[PDB]
Amino acid sequence: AKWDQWSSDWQTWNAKWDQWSNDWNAWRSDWQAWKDDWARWNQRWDNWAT
Amino acid sequence: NAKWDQWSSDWQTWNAKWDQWSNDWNAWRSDWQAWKDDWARWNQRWDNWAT
Amino acid sequence: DQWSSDWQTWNAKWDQWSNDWNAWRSDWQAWKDDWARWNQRWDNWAT
Amino acid sequence: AKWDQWSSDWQTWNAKWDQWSNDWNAWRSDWQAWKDDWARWNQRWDNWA
Amino acid sequence: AKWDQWSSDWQTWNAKWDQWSNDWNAWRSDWQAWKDDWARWNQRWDNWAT
Numbered sequence: 001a002k003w004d005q006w007s008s009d010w011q012t013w014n015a016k017w018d019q020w021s022n023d024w025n026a027w028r029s030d031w032q033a034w035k036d037d038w039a040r041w042n043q044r045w046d047n048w049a050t
Numbered sequence: 051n052a053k054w055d056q057w058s059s060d061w062q063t064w065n066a067k068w069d070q071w072s073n074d075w076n077a078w079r080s081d082w083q084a085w086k087d088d089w090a091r092w093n094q095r096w097d098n099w100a101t
Numbered sequence: 102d103q104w105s106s107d108w109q110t111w112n113a114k115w116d117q118w119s120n121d122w123n124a125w126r127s128d129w130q131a132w133k134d135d136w137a138r139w140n141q142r143w144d145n146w147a148t
Numbered sequence: 149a150k151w152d153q154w155s156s157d158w159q160t161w162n163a164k165w166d167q168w169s170n171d172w173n174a175w176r177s178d179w180q181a182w183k184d185d186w187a188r189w190n191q192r193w194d195n196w197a
Numbered sequence: 198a199k200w201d202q203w204s205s206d207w208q209t210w211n212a213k214w215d216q217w218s219n220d221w222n223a224w225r226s227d228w229q230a231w232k233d234d235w236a237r238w239n240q241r242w243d244n245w246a247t
Contacts, residue, residue, distance in 0.1 A: 005058075009061060017213075020072055021213075027082070028220070028224055031224070042238050044097075046241065050245070053105075060105070074126065078129070085136075104154075104155075107155070107158055114162075114166075114169070121176070125179070128183070132186075135187070139190050142194075143197070164211075168218055171222065178228075178229070192243070
């Protein structure tokens with residue numbers, strides 16, 4: 001009962017954590033894609049100015 | 051089992067706190083993606099300004 | 102046993118960390134608003 | 149004694165958590181320092197207006 | 198036994214958390230690097246202006 005309820009509760013937690021982890025992964029990839037766009041825009045303006 | 055029910059309550063309590071935190075992070079994540087879109091929008095404006 | 106006090110201890114750590122994240126979020130939204138204000142200011146000048 | 153082993157495991161988890169929290173705190177401090185440098189540069193470009 | 202299940206599950210959790218920690222730490226490195234690139238570009242534009 002108790003150890004089976006706890007194993008269920010731990011599975012449910014793990015599922016919640018995994019989905020959060022995936023979302024932070026996705027956000028990380030979005031930040032790196034942003035950082036690449038940022039670099040590319042600086043370049044475009046450097047060429048434009050010089 | 052009093053101690054077991056206490057723990058169960060403690061675990062449920064912390065999970066609601068996690069869920070609220072996770073909500074707050076989802077909200078922040080949406081605000082960041084709105085900002086990233088604004089940043090692109092203003093890049094386009096400044097590029098228009100120079101063209 | 103010692104479990105219940107130990108859990109209370111890490112729970113306080115968590116609550117405090119959560120509040121430090123809320124404080125950073127606050128700071129980030131103030132920064133995002135200032136970023137917007139600066140863009141508006143320069144647009145006002147450049148157009 | 150199962151509860152004694154769990155108590156030690158929990159000490160190790162708490163020390164790992166504490167490390168992560170110190171690294172989060174240090175990043176926060178870095179971000180605030182960056183925010184201030186960003187505002188100073190805005191104020192600087194504002195002299196080109 | 199069930200408690201050997203708990204110890205096992207705990208260790209598996211810790212390995213999954215450790216990967217997340219490592220990933221956040223990698224992200225924090227990439228943010229600092231970005232911060233350096235941002236500081237450099239601000240100088241680059243400061244010179245174009247004088």
